[model samples]
Target: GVHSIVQQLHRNSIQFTDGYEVKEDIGVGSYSVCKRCIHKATNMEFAVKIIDKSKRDPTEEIEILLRYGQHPNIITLKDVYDDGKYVYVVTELMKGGELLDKILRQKFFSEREASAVLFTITKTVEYLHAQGVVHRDLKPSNILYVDESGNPESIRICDFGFAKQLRAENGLLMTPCYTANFVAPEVLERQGYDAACDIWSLGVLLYTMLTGYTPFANGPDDTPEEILARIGSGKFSLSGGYWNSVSDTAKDLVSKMLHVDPHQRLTAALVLRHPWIVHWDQLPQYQLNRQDAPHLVKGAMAATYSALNRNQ
Candidate 1:
């Protein structure tokens, strides 16, 4: 029974090459590079984010991923190997790309389809909320697909680098950091904000999914402060892109979430039970006349959060 401890003992010291055969770089961050890797025993593929220990501590984020690994929509850390210079994090490979990847390209996006997509994201947020975790950045890239097939259920919400555990003693999260365009109004007010900020971001996300353009942002050239001012005003028009064909029930959901008053914003629980979400399958699918939404929105989606983390 004690020999079983061999698995846990390697966390103290080990070489990444002892197990995973490293593959070429797929992505990079400021502190680390993500490479494709394979398990020698199982031949299973995974992403190995090689983090230099001299650069920073990886344990906090690693522990958090381990804690939430059981979730269907969250990344599962399969192995953690620490060596002399760096630590190798082996997570389920997500090569499917970001959220809404070609989900809205076709001229016909049903309210049912939109709501169905949102349900998974909202449930993941709900789970994070109950755990006192706030994913400050909810950009499309943060929600990744497991493979090229792009199953909505297989999408994984990642990038916990910006996430924080909001303890009751520290009050609501005070950090002002966030990705651009998708942030909540209260977060910019200098006062502390809560998990509700995430809901507001999702509201923005929902609006974009329907319209193929961000609700608050007017164009790609808009500066951060300009977006900041507009979000503070909390005024957005649903008149752009595909709004003509989208349902009022969906509009109602967006309006409630975009409510400037954070207290009045819908909680993750309520979003799950929303009439639009509850009856997603039966919701009407319109054969829209517009065909330009996909190309227009692809850059539009990236443009919304383009400032913070530019695509690698």
Candidate 2:
């Protein structure tokens, strides 16, 4: 049955192999195709991302995957195989929810839930930086959530192709809008940037979660340049309503994360020490699971190791 399913899937497109049982097409990004599939060996579900060799350097991506290893808050690559044209990367499935989609659809998370998710994401990004890697994309959708037996699951950072090692002393690679909106003035004006760019992205994400809208506006329907100008000027402010709901600790953290200069942006290490994160354990909703999340990755460190080692 699995062979027949795989064969039919391969016939449908060059993006997937003849062995993967196609479940649902999850997403399409600039560099690859994503879908949900079942591992025939374990009867387990995984979000399989198929990358077209023509579109990206699969070898480089695979190297980074190995570097990241098994991060609890970042999606882990289970297996990698190829059919020459494409490479299939099987990953842990996120079933509880995607933070951005949930927030956008539900409008707002309670102060507790929002804080919980943000802190988890912040810690994960911090871990990435500690490993000398930077996630070029840090948005709400990029933040995933999973709740099992009422325990908080890991918020693994997804989509690592855009990420690259920060080999330069002052890394300057940048992404427009999402990263641009929160970019320090120096970066917006082309002064320069580095890991601090991720800080700005975090700030923008915080603003979106709080106000449900971006801070800069180029006359209501702001043009890209106009918004860039506002960001570069570092002349924006947040107060009242949604902003009020956010704690001072949270706001203070944003203030530091979105500094107009890279030097001023809070380092992830420092962020981990912030009261918001340090005291996160005090919150009821900020439950950190010792066990792997449901439908997510399992590792060699456990008794379940043999049952889940797809990398073999």
Candidate 3:
């Protein structure tokens, strides 16, 4: 009966009207709700993002996913359904959880492992940029592994809500859309930015992964003005317990990515070829864990989000 219902819906061209069961709410965003869903007949699991069409159009996300879905590190969009009030996007289930959770749970994270993770992210971003797509929101929460196996290499880039496709001839984007902590200096300065913006975010993310903290630390009750000043100055330190354990090559790559001059920053393509990213196997492994500085890491994340909300 369930199979027939699915078939009937398909035959009649009704999208997601039946044969799927809502399992539970997995995540909640500003205007979207992510839920775990299942195909009744096949018992296959999927993630369905339901968006309020009244507030924002869903076509952009759908279009971007469809264009870049074939990549291994990017989430795959299986289908889409739009009712009068809402839009449903079904994507492949990612059970391994967010990249943040994975990093926080690890006792020892190796440079090789972290570099491998970055390679996947950079490769995927390279593909997206090549396709004229810019993932404005590139962070740990948006990065997820395919399954619960917790392999960093299995990470996939998810969430295209902030994505935009631009033309090569006129690709300068001026919109100030980004998470505050990872926001590029040019974006905060109101200068129009391009794909290079993503490079800055990648640098922030990579720094966080290796150091267990953000390069730019927000002091207690730090004003948005203060935070922006730190970012725009393009100044952050790699001198700490975590930094000492990591290689110079790794730090060198980060320095290039986080460069203030967007014009001088390394593109995703260039990042892939860097020795730190390309020769991941040569990095020495270290016993890195929360013992390294869990409190510092958690505080950094909390403080960053507070700044993000304050700016909004």
After superposing candidate 1, which stretches have Cα over 4 Å from the reference? 1-13, 168-192, 288-303, 306-312
Backbone clashes in model 3: 2
Residue 179: error of model 2 in Å? 27
Worst lDDT 10-window in candidate 2: 294-303
What stretches of model 3 exceed 4 Å from their correct place? 1-17, 167-192, 218-223, 289-299, 302-312
Winner on lDDT (2 vs 3): 3
What's the distance in Å from true for residue 201, model 1? Answer: 2.1
Clashing pairs in 1: none
Number of backbone collisions per candidate: 0, 1, 2
Q: Is candidate 1 or candidate 3 better by lDDT?
A: 3
Give me the runs in candidate 2 sitting further than 4 Å from their true place: 1-19, 104-108, 146-151, 167-192, 217-222, 280-312
> Model 1: per-residue lDDT, tens digit, 49-82?
9887778767657766877878999988887776
Q: What is the number of residue pairs that collide in model 2?
A: 1
Pitting candidate 1 against candidate 3, the one with the higher TM-score is 3
lDDT for predicted candidate 3 compared with the true structure: 0.74
In model 1, the worst 10-residue window by lDDT is: 167-176
**Which pairs clash inside model 2?**
73-156
Clash pairs of candidate 3? 96-147, 107-288
